C-alpha cells in the first residue's frame, strides 16, 4: 500500500549511510552549544540584541575567570 509520501531518515540512519574520537569531541562541542543556545531566548531576538547578549555573557565569563 504505497502512498505519495516521501520519508526522511533519522540522523542516525544518515550517519550510518555516511559512516575516531575527534568527531566525538566535535559533536559534544555541538551538544554543549545547543544547550547554551536553547536555554536562553535567542530565537526571539533579531540579530543585534542576540549579538549584544552574546558579547555580554562572554564578558561575564571572561571577567569571572580573570578574577578567579
Amino acid at each position: 500500500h504505497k502512498s505519495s509520501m516521501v520519508y526522511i531518515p533519522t540522523t542516525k540512519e544518515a550517519k550510518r549511510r555516511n559512516g575516531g574520537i575527534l568527531n566525538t569531541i566535535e559533536e559534544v562541542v555541538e551538544k554543549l552549544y545547543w544547550t547554551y543556545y536553547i536555554h536562553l531566548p535567542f530565537y526571539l531576538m533579531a540579530s543585534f540584541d542576540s549579538f549584544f547578549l552574546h558579547v555580554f555573557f562572554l564578558t561575564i565569563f571572561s571577567l569571572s575567570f580573570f578574577g578567579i
Partner: protein, 149 residues
C-alpha cells in the same frame, strides 16, 4: 466600579496578575537578587558600593514594573483595568495575602542585610533608607490603594 465593569472584570481570570501565585514565583525574587550581587561585584568596586547598587536597582526595577504602568498589556474586554497597576490586581484586589506579605518583607530584609557594610557613611545610609522606605513599602500599604497624585 459599576455592575457592568465588575462583571467584565470577574468574567475572566486576569492573565497579567495571576502568575504570581504559581510554582517558582517566590524563589525568582530571591534568585534575581543573588545575580545582581555577582554582577556588581564583577564591576570590581568596594563592598558598600556593590551592596547599595544592588539594593537600589532592585527597588527601582520592582517599582517601575509593579507600580508605574496602568492597565493590561493586551485587550481584556474593553480593557476593564484601564486605570489599575499590576500590584493592585494581585489576588483580585484582596489585601495582605501571603504573596503581598512576602513582597512587603523582601525590601526590609534587603536593607537589613545591606546595612552592615555602608553603615559607616552617613550619606549612603540616609539615601538608602530614604529610597527603601519611600519607593518600597509606602506604595504597597493598604492606605495608598487607588490613590492618584
Amino acid at each position: 466600579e459599576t455592575f457592568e465593569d465588575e462583571n467584565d472584570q470577574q468574567m475572566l481570570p486576569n492573565m497579567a496578575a495571576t502568575w504570581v501565585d504559581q510554582r517558582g514565583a517566590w524563589l525568582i525574587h530571591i534568585v534575581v537578587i543573588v545575580l545582581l550581587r555577582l554582577f556588581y561585584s564583577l564591576f570590581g568596586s568596594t563592598p558598600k558600593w556593590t551592596w547599595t547598587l544592588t539594593n537600589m536597582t532592585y527597588i527601582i526595577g520592582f517599582y517601575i514594573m509593579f507600580h508605574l504602568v496602568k492597565g493590561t498589556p493586551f485587550d481584556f474586554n474593553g480593557g476593564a483595568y484601564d486605570n489599575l497597576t499590576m500590584w493592585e490586581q494581585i489576588n483580585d484586589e484582596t489585601l495582605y495575602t501571603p504573596t503581598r506579605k512576602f513582597l512587603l518583607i523582601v525590601p526590609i530584609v534587603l536593607f537589613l542585610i545591606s546595612n552592615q557594610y555602608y553603615r559607616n557613611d552617613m550619606t549612603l545610609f540616609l539615601s538608602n533608607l530614604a529610597v527603601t522606605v519611600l519607593i518600597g513599602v509606602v506604595p504597597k500599604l493598604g492606605i495608598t490603594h487607588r490613590l492618584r497624585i
